């Protein structure tokens, strides 16, 4: 075999053997991992080329994810895609967006809240265009369709409907749960879509809030976070045994705005039929709905009337049935 060869020498030839072993290791996870970033970065051009914006935005997200945690570069995947091709369909996409994420960016910072919101509309951006330098090379331009042309509102929703999706169910813009509020402004978004009143002005102004006037946040005419309105069965607390901490002091009108509020947060997190058809049902299941349904005047009591809270309550689901229905 090696016959005679040292103690010594083995030792050496043992370990100048080990490098070239992890050399060799390394060269295949390396050829592995791009192999699989490869299909990745695929599956995000597919839903590109399918006009679908809330996936390919996704599937992009996967790819950077993946690219990230594997300490990988668009130069180094670059050679492994000199194979496929990005439509000019696509790269007319790719610029709407860019367009779109990049005004939504600089609208989303108002005097009441200029960090989260704008800095999550370039998260995306960002990272859209990584999907895209990991193929275009540095010195190339894109070649985009100047006839195909999205809607810059679809473009948009789809933005939101992203956002919505990856951030946490404890992720704040100004004063509001980011779901709730991104879920919000799809709506008013789509609104526009539907009464064909879409426009540079109109838009700017929907991307330019965080909803801080809660007598149209949350569509309860009389929401306010103090005395509020008067009565003759206040809504309280007690009476009941389920209701969380929090709604103590809590006082009739400045309450069910309060309750309303969690409401509109908790019904955010719904992410199809079922699983919003439960989020309902587990609310209307609980104490302080009841405490909405309530009266808070003779009148509207001894006739039974579907209160406001409850009349608002209803709302907000059907937005976000909706906010859902076209998801699909």
């Known amino acids: 075999p090696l016959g005679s060869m040292p103690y010594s020498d083995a030792k050496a030839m043992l370990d100048e053997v080990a490098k070239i072993r992890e050399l060799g290791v390394q060269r295949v996870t390396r050829i592995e991992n791009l192999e699989n970033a490869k299909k990745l970065w695929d599956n995000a051009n597919s839903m590109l080329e399918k006009g679908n914006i809330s996936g390919y935005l996704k599937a992009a997200n996967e790819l950077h994810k993946f690219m990230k945690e594997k300490n990988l570069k668009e130069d180094d995947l670059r050679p492994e895609l000199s194979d496929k091709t990005i439509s000019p369909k696509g790269y007319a996409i790719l610029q709407s967006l860019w367009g779109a994420a990049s005004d939504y960016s600089r609208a989303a910072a108002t005097l009441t809240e200029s960090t989260v919101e704008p800095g999550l509309v370039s998260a995306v951006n960002k990272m859209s265009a990584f999907f895209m330098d990991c193929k275009l090379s540095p010195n190339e331009r894109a070649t985009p369709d100047p006839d195909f042309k999205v809607g810059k509102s679809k473009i948009l929703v789809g933005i939101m409907q992203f956002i919505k999706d990856v951030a946490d169910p404890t992720s704040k813009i100004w004063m509001h749960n980011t779901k709730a509020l991104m879920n919000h402004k799809i709506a008013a978004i789509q609104k526009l879509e539907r009464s064909n009143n879409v426009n540079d002005e109109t838009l700017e102004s929907v991307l330019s809030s965080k909803g801080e006037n809660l007598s149209e946040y949350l569509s309860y005419k009389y929401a306010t976070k103090d005395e509020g309105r008067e009565h003759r069965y206040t809504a309280s607390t007690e009476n009941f045994k389920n209701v969380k901490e929090k709604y103590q002091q809590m006082r009739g009108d400045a309450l069910k705005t309060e309750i309303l509020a969690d409401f ?64 699909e």
């Open 264 to 327: 509109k947060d908790k019904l955010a997190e719904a992410t199809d039929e079922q699983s919003l058809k439960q989020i309902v049902a587990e609310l209307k299941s609980k104490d302080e709905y009841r405490i909405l349904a309530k009266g808070q005047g003779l009148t509207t009591q001894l006739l039974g009337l579907k209160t406001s809270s409850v009349s608002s309550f209803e709302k907000m689901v059907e937005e976000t049935r909706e906010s859902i229905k076209s998801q």
